[PDB]
């Protein structure tokens, strides 16, 4: 029976990939309480996040390159176990070098679990149904972003910050074991039946336009999430519950954005679905400007929630659009390399959000850094609008 095994395996990957993201973002979930008991400046936080981002970038790139000669279940279980172990260790350390080393290892382990999902999806599902399943997998990510912050704060009001990560880590370990028991690599182990050149790929302007757009979008999203959580409390006179609700609403909006963008793009030199992407980017920068300027010490909370949801929608739509367009325009025999390059550029964009942004905020203010980010986003949107009727097919032409 294909259906039974498909359902079981997909549920197992859903749970494992949700725990992956939860343990990845636990630091952003608890950061305010940890800063409250251990006095730290913005530079230390930026250093830790940048170290994790760099480690994840290198590990994911190399694992994606060499994934063709490893088993999916073992890699998934190993990665989950290592992430749980480093999360458990994090709950006992109380210094800035140990935190940075532990999160570097966290990124290294988190980079391992990406290729197995694609391998299982390709082995167990039809080639014409990849993206759809990809889509729902992305929703799991958003789910981990939604339940994470608020619960953490709810636990923080009566328990230590160190009593959450540790518990989370334990869960991962247990789930990892269940994952190995519940994941089969191919529909044959159970028993039931189963051009261009590299010099021409990198010499395509559209390949760099897409990469730079993804870089900008990912960096701006990471900046908004972590440093707006801190911005709402440290400068706008709001409490930590509002800071957590802002991120929860951001992820709630991002879920519906990721779900819808595929439908709107599919119903609709250049690409047919560039207008939706440009509109979403414009909405993202407009919402950023409104959030920076309108919110004061005395403002209703459902205005902040609306701003967060709108930004999440306008940020998570373009990510799916970028992925689908990169898959569609890729050379016929170089899809994996193109996906790896675009992911690497998105990861370096996310890396740029940690330390330089925190240093700018430390020197001038949070407002100045957010204004710089919004200015960069507006300039990128204008440039993308200008550079939109160029060749979209990459390769030997
Ligand atoms: O391949 C994909 C994504 C979707 C995809 C694949 C085959 C398809 O046939 C399809 O319709 C859709 O990679 C994802 C997007 C990524 O940014 C990229 O594409 O560069 C890299 C990484 O971030 C991944 O999340």
Curated annotation (Swiss-Prot):
Its main location: endoplasmic reticulum. Signal peptide: none annotated. It is a multi-pass membrane protein. Keywords: Antiport, Congenital disorder of glycosylation, Disease variant, Endoplasmic reticulum, Glycogen storage disease, Membrane, Sugar transport, Transmembrane, Transmembrane helix, Transport. It comes from the Eukaryota. The chain crosses the membrane at residues 80-100, 101-121, 135-155, 163-183, 200-220, 241-261, 275-295, 302-322, 341-361, 367-387. The keyword Nucleus does not apply. It catalyses: D-glucose 6-phosphate(in) + phosphate(out) = D-glucose 6-phosphate(out) + phosphate(in). It is found in: Endoplasmic reticulum membrane. InterPro entries: MFS, MFS_dom, MFS_trans_sf, OPA_Antiporter, Sugar-P_transporter_CS, Sugar_P_transporter. Mostly expressed in liver and kidney. GO terms for cellular component: endoplasmic reticulum; endoplasmic reticulum membrane; membrane. GO terms for biological process: gluconeogenesis; glucose homeostasis; glucose metabolic process; glucose-6-phosphate transport; phosphate ion transmembrane transport. It holds the Pfam family MFS_1. One of its GO terms (molecular function) is glucose-6-phosphate transmembrane transporter activity. Inhibited by vanadate and chlorogenic acid. Belongs to the major facilitator superfamily. Organophosphate:Pi antiporter (OPA) (TC 2.A.1.4) family. Inorganic phosphate and glucose-6-phosphate antiporter of the endoplasmic reticulum. Transports cytoplasmic glucose-6-phosphate into the lumen of the endoplasmic reticulum and translocates inorganic phosphate into the opposite direction. Forms with glucose-6-phosphatase the complex responsible for glucose production through glycogenolysis and gluconeogenesis. Hence, it plays a central role in homeostatic regulation of blood glucose levels. It is linked to Glycogen storage disease 1B: A metabolic disorder characterized by impairment of terminal steps of glycogenolysis and gluconeogenesis. Patients manifest a wide range of clinical symptoms and biochemical abnormalities, including hypoglycemia, severe hepatomegaly due to excessive accumulation of glycogen, kidney enlargement, growth retardation, lactic acidemia, hyperlipidemia, and hyperuricemia. Glycogen storage disease type 1B patients also present a tendency towards infections associated with neutropenia, relapsing aphthous gingivostomatitis, and inflammatory bowel disease. This is Glucose-6-phosphate exchanger SLC37A4.
């Amino acid at each position: 029976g294909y259906g039974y095994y498909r359902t079981v395996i997909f549920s197992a990957m859903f749970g494992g990939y949700s725990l992956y993201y939860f343990n990845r973002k636990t630091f952003s979930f608890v950061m305010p309480s940890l800063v409250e008991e251990i006095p730290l400046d913005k530079d230390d936080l930026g250093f830790i996040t940048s170290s994790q981002s760099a480690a994840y970038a290198i590990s994911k790139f190399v694992s994606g390159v060499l994934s063709d000669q490893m088993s999916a279940r073992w890699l998934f279980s190993s990665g989950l176990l290592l992430v749980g172990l480093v999360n458990i260790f994090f709950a006992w350390s109380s210094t800035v070098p140990v935190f940075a080393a532990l999160w570097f290892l966290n990124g290294l382990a988190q980079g391992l679990g990406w290729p197995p999902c694609g391998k299982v999806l390709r082995k167990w599902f039809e080639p014409s149904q990849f993206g759809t399943w990809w889509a729902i997998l992305s929703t799991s990510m958003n789910l981990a972003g939604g339940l994470g912050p608020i619960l953490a704060t709810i636990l923080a009001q009566s328990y230590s910050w160190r009593s959450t990560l540790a518990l989370s880590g334990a869960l991962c370990v247990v789930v990892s074991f269940l994952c190995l028991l519940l994941i089969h690599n191919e529909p044959a182990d159970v028993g039931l039946r189963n051009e261009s050149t590299l010099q021409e790929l990198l010499l395509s302007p559209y390949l760099w336009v897409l990469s730079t757009g993804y870089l900008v979008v990912f960096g701006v999203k990471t900046c908004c999430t972590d440093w707006g959580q801190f911005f709402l409390i440290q400068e706008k006179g709001q409490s930590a519950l509002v800071g957590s609700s802002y991120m929860s609403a951001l992820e709630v909006g991002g879920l519906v954005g990721s779900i819808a963008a595929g439908y709107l793009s599919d119903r609709a030199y250049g690409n047919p679905r560039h207008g939706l992407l440009l509109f979403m980017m414009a909405g993202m920068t407009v919402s950023m400007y409104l959030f920076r300027v309108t919110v004061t010490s005395d403002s209703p909370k459902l205005w902040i929630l609306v701003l967060g949801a709108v930004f999440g929608f306008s940020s998570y739509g373009p990510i799916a659009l970028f992925g689908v367009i990169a898959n569609e325009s890729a050379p016929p025999n170089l899809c994996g390399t193109s996906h790896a390059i675009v992911g690497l550029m998105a990861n370096v964009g996310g890396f740029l959000a940690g330390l330089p942004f925190s240093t700018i905020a430390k020197h001038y203010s949070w407002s100045t850094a957010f204004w710089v980010a919004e200015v960069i986003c507006a300039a990128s949107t204008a440039a993308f609008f200008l550079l939109r009727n160029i060749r979209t097919k990459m390769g030997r032409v």
